Amino acid sequence: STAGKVIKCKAAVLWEEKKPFSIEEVEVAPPKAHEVRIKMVATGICRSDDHVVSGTLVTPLPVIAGHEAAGIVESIGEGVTTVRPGDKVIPLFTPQCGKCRVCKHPEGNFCLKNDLSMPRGTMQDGTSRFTCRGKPIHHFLGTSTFSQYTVVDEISVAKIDAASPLEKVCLIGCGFSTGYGSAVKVAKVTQGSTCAVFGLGGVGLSVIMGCKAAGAARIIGVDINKDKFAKAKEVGATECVNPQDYKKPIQEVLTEMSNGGVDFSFEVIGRLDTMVTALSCCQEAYGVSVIVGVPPDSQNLSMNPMLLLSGRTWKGAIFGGFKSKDSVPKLVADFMAKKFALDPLITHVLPFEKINEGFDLLRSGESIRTILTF
Amino acid sequence: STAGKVIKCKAAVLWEEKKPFSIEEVEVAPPKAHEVRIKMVATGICRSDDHVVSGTLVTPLPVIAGHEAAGIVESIGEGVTTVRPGDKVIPLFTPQCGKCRVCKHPEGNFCLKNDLSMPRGTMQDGTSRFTCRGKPIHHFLGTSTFSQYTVVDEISVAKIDAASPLEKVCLIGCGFSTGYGSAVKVAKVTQGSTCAVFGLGGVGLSVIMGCKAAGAARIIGVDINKDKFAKAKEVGATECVNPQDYKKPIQEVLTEMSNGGVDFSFEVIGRLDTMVTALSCCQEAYGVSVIVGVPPDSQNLSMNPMLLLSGRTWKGAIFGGFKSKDSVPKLVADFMAKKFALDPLITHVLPFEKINEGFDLLRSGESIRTILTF
Ligand SMILES: NC(=O)c1ccc[n+]([C@@H]2O[C@H](COP(=O)([O-])OP(=O)([O-])OC[C@H]3O[C@@H](n4cnc5c(N)[nH+]cnc54)[C@H](O)[C@@H]3O)[C@@H](O)[C@H]2O)c1
Ligand SMILES: NC(=O)c1ccc[n+]([C@@H]2O[C@H](COP(=O)([O-])OP(=O)([O-])OC[C@H]3O[C@@H](n4cnc5c(N)[nH+]cnc54)[C@H](O)[C@@H]3O)[C@@H](O)[C@H]2O)c1
Ligand SMILES: OCc1c(F)c(F)c(F)c(F)c1F
Ligand SMILES: OCc1c(F)c(F)c(F)c(F)c1F
Numbered sequence: 001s002t003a004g005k006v007i008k009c010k011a012a013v014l015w016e017e018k019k020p021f022s023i024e025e026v027e028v029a030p031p032k033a034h035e036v037r038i039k040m041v042a043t044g045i046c047r048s049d050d051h052v053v054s055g056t057l058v059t060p061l062p063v064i065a066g067h068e069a070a071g072i073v074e075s076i077g078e079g080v081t082t083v084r085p086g087d088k089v090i091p092l093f094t095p096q097c098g099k100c101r102v103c104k105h106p107e108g109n110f111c112l113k114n115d116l117s118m119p120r121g122t123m124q125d126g127t128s129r130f131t132c133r134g135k136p137i138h139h140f141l142g143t144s145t146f147s148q149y150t151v152v153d154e155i156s157v158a159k160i161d162a163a164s165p166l167e168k169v170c171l172i173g174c175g176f177s178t179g180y181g182s183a184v185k186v187a188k189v190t191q192g193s194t195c196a197v198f199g200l201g202g203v204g205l206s207v208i209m210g211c212k213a214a215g216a217a218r219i220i221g222v223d224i225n226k227d228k229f230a231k232a233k234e235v236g237a238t239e240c241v242n243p244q245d246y247k248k249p250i251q252e253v254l255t256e257m258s259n260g261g262v263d264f265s266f267e268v269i270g271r272l273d274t275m276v277t278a279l280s281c282c283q284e285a286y287g288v289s290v291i292v293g294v295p296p297d298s299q300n301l302s303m304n305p306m307l308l309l310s311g312r313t314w315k316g317a318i319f320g321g322f323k324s325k326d327s328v329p330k331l332v333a334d335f336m337a338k339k340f341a342l343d344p345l346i347t348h349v350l351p352f353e354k355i356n357e358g359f360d361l362l363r364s365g366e367s368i369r370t371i372l373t374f
Numbered sequence: 375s376t377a378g379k380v381i382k383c384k385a386a387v388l389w390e391e392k393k394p395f396s397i398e399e400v401e402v403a404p405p406k407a408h409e410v411r412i413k414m415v416a417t418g419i420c421r422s423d424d425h426v427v428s429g430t431l432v433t434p435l436p437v438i439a440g441h442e443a444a445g446i447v448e449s450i451g452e453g454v455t456t457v458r459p460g461d462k463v464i465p466l467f468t469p470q471c472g473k474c475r476v477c478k479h480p481e482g483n484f485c486l487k488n489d490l491s492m493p494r495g496t497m498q499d500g501t502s503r504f505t506c507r508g509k510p511i512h513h514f515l516g517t518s519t520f521s522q523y524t525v526v527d528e529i530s531v532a533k534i535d536a537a538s539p540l541e542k543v544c545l546i547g548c549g550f551s552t553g554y555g556s557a558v559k560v561a562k563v564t565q566g567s568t569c570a571v572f573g574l575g576g577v578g579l580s581v582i583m584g585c586k587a588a589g590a591a592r593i594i595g596v597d598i599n600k601d602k603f604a605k606a607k608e609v610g611a612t613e614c615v616n617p618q619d620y621k622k623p624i625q626e627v628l629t630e631m632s633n634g635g636v637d638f639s640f641e642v643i644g645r646l647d648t649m650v651t652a653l654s655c656c657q658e659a660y661g662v663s664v665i666v667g668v669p670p671d672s673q674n675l676s677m678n679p680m681l682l683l684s685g686r687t688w689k690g691a692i693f694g695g696f697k698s699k700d701s702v703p704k705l706v707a708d709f710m711a712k713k714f715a716l717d718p719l720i721t722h723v724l725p726f727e728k729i730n731e732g733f734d735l736l737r738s739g740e741s742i743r744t745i746l747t748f
């Protein structure tokens with residue numbers, strides 16, 4: 001039995017950038033007040049985890065990464081009221097404190113307690129629950145799901161349906177909810193509209209799913225890897241285009257295809273150039289473009305503000321605009337009610353010990369989501 | 375007595391950038407099919423007219439500028455159905471053809487027949503109705519209101535109330551409608567919100583008017599000319615700040631003042647740096663920033679897309695987002711019913727022949743709107 005005790009378990013530690021994860025024993029402290037210790041069941045490999053490895057995202061190292069996951073509560077600290085031992089849960093990489101001005105705002109979800117903006121790599125109290133070889137190890141986004149056990153703040157966990165298949169619903173922890181919400185909530189895609197989706201990975205496919213759910217008449221997938229096209233069409237793309245096939249810039253191609261610009265465009269890659277291209281390809285007077293991708297740290301884009309003066313709307317969002325703790329249980333309930341599918345996103349299922357192999361599949365272009373099972 | 379005939383009249387011709395207007399005789403051709411010839415009554419001096427002089431805004435020269443005006447129809451070409459001789463009218467620098475995809479869209483106003491994006495300086499048919507010293511003179515935005523008579527396409531004129539005071543309602547042709555609409559229609563400012571308005575000229579004062587009308591609790595005016603602050607407070611600013619007074623960048627100042635960022639910001643100047651500052655000062659998760667100012671030709675801004683990824687919305691608009699021909703008569707009607715005031719914008723009145731003095735007043739910082747009377 002483990003409650004109140006330090007757990008020794010296996011985790012994937014990233015000691016420095018641009019190296020493989022190291023799978024080894026860590027010590028996980030018990031939860032303090034208002035904290036929750038979770039036995040992990042499944043975690044997905046999101047491109048944002050790879051950004052930590054590549055240096056695209058800067059966060060304190062060494063670190064236990066991972067943010068798209070599901071597990072079962074092992075124990076709770078004093079004062080926890082929203083989960084109990086035995087509950088199925090999804091960690092929330094965007095917290096929902098319920099108290100800050102963002103949480104109180106009808107359209108805000110980027111809770112001020114987040115550890116994304118100015119990452120500290122800690123619990124809310126500024127300390128870590130992880131040690132490895134006698135050294136403290138940083139948390140990632142208050143989640144750190146690449147471990148058999150993690151400790152999260154109560155504001156960073158949601159209880160979900162006890163009958164949930166955790167090996168599927170872990171995707172509601174990041175990639176599905178992000179893409180789907182980006183379409184249905186952030187963009188507010190309309191019936192009959194034309195959409196362009198740049199990047200056809202797990203997140204972009206989820207954007208397509210949302211655009212189709214919203215009733216878009218045309219959904220144009222854009223990727224430089226044509227191997228991504230078949231699955232994009234399966235989940236709703238009406239056409240796919242590879243910028244490499246064209247002599248002209250793809251914004252011009254997409255403007256021509258849409259007879260003057262698309263209604264909604266989405267950048268779901270993480271490149272400055274495609275952010276500007278995506279904005280440009282939406283119709284100049286009434287188009288909307290949503291940035292979903294995470295670009296390289298500290299780099300600025302260049303753009304002509306006449307693109308906006310004519311009437312375009314440019315926005316971005318974290319986690320599909322969803323208030324995380326309110327939304328995750330409902331999304332799981334909707335999944336259980338067959339309102340959307342997750343299997344199209346899952347291309348590979350590997351034991352947790354094969355994390356590096358899972359990352360290699362992503363980097364090679366061969367996978368959408370690999371789910372790692374503990 | 376002049377129908378079908380060439381009219382010789384005085385106009386303000388701009389032969390060269392960075393030079394005074396030349397008030398001299400021009401020949402104004404009669405209207406062709408679907409054109410309207412207008413005897414001008416009053417025209418305002420908008421900073422965008424000055425941008426033509428300074429080269430901020432590139433349009434073919436030589437030119438008759440002017441776009442904020444009101445007059446009386448002198449004659450109509452074949453097939454005109456929406457105005458008649460003797461009607462009071464406002465020229466529409468943003469046309470409303472009623473047929474293009476933008477005109478048909480519920481939120482679009484930047485009609486595809488505009489001459490703003492890629493100016494040709496002609497009538498819709500690609501020709502000019504103006505001759506001076508035997509030489510063809512370009513139009514500006516299909517309006518060319520710095521002339522005793524102009525000819526406009528039917529899609530570029532609106533009939534207004536016969537009892538309208540033209541020396542006031544000319545401001546509905548640009549500055550008032552732009553600022554007011556930017557707040558009430560484009561931003562959709564909410565009751566109780568905090569707004570920041572960069573630039574306290576005629577357009578920014580009109581933005582303040584709209585924010586107040588929408589029920590904003592705080593309206594922070596920002597200008598480097600503190601002489602602008604008294605009128606900004608008269609029309610609704612709750613506080614004014616001069617960036618030059620502060621050691622820190624004004625986005626940081628405004629974030630502090632608003633306890634974490636404003637709900638709505640407006641760039642109403644035309645500088646790349648203030649466009650980025652205005653975006654930054656709105657709250658990172660749910661803030662909205664609207665670009666109103668006209669940027670220097672062909673220049674790109676630089677910004678970090680993380681400003682958007684957190685949840686900000688960035689947009690721009692021409693003419694306050696109003697569909698021009700539908701909206702201008704309604705705005706005039708509302709003015710007549712005292713639903714908004716125009717006098718706070720009018721600081722100087724001059725005869726048309728003193729146009730250059732009117733521009734001097736704008737450039738010195740002394741005026742908001744000078745109204746020229748023909
Ligand atoms: N905003 C959020 O909350 C959020 C959530 C999840 C992921 N992300 C980011 O979203 C992005 C996509 O994540 P993912 O779906 O896991 O990644 P992914 O599975 O690597 O998919 C990216 C796709 O982009 C394609 N691609 C690469 N370069 C180009 C190019 N020049 N043009 C067109 N296509 C190109 C690539 O072939 C691939 O199919 C990443 O930057 C993530 O970090 C953001
Ligand atoms: N989008 C449209 O449809 C539209 C319509 C009308 C005007 N405009 C543009 O809107 C802008 C404002 O026009 P206007 O009100 O007639 O001009 P204006 O009267 O010149 O007002 C601009 C104000 O900006 C102030 N200012 C200048 N530099 C700074 C600075 N660095 N920081 C803070 N304040 C500063 C300046 O002191 C002045 O009071 C111009 O760029 C116009 O071209 C756009
Ligand atoms: O994939 C979700 C995700 C993001 F959207 C980020 F902006 C980020 F910094 C990060 F670490 C992350 F995991
Ligand atoms: O002041 C209105 C106005 C604009 F908003 C422009 F973008 C422009 F190019 C122009 F010529 C103009 F007059």
Ligand SMILES: [Zn+2]
Nearest residue numbers: 097100103111
């Ligand atoms: Zn919060």
Ligand SMILES: [Zn+2]
Nearest residue numbers: 046048174175
């Ligand atoms: Zn992710």
Ligand SMILES: [Zn+2]
Nearest residue numbers: 471474477485
């Ligand atoms: Zn039109």
Ligand SMILES: [Zn+2]
Nearest residue numbers: 420422548549
């Ligand atoms: Zn103007």
